[PDB]
């Protein structure tokens, strides 16, 4: 989009994506949350060990870059965050729940074929097939929203292909 998100800061976009449909009792996130959420040693490639300050970091720049939202108000005080990424009330962005799911883990495990994106988005939506996850990310890269996924060059032997999301740039 506008931005590009960094390794670190896609990591704190995909764990606000993941955990506003898998945790939403917890959802928004307060900044322990969303440190938590980043440095989880399941569903994470890289697993990552970012600080507290770090985060905090992260969570002001893509505030201000209007992807994320401070909710105050009272109840202990503790600032949650909410996205403005995707489907607010506000933005341009519209994503369905089998494109959010498909955006997530790749911002949150890298590069991915369709049939790993099959087992680790139905967390967050179920696909009733692998046809399902092919029509999404063929979607994904179609809009003229804009290129969302890429596909890479298939591997040596390796039977499928993997897509990766643009949100931090080419590869
Ligand atoms: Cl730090």
Redesign the pocket.
């Known amino acids: 989009m506008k931005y590009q998100l960094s390794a670190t800061e896609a990591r704190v976009i995909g764990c606000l994506l993941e955990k506003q449909v898998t945790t939403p009792e917890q959802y928004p996130l307060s900044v322990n949350a969303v440190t938590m959420a980043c440095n989880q040693k399941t569903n994470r490639e890289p697993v990552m060990n970012?600080?507290?300050?770090?985060?905090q970091?992260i969570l002001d720049e893509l505030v201000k870059r209007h992807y994320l939202r401070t909710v105050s108000g009272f109840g202990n005080r503790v600032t949650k965050y909410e996205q403005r990424f995707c489907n607010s009330e506000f933005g341009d962005l519209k994503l369905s729940a089998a494109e959010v799911a498909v955006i997530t883990t790749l911002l949150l495990r890298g590069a991915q074929t369709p049939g790993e994106l099959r087992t680790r988005a139905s967390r967050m939506h179920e696909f009733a097939d692998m046809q399902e996850v092919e029509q999404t990310l063929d979607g994904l890269a179609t809009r003229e929203d804009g290129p969302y996924v890429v596909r890479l060059a298939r591997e040596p032997g390796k039977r499928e292909s993997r897509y990766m999301h643009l949100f931090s740039g080419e590869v």
């Open positions: 970012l600080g507290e300050h770090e985060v970091d």
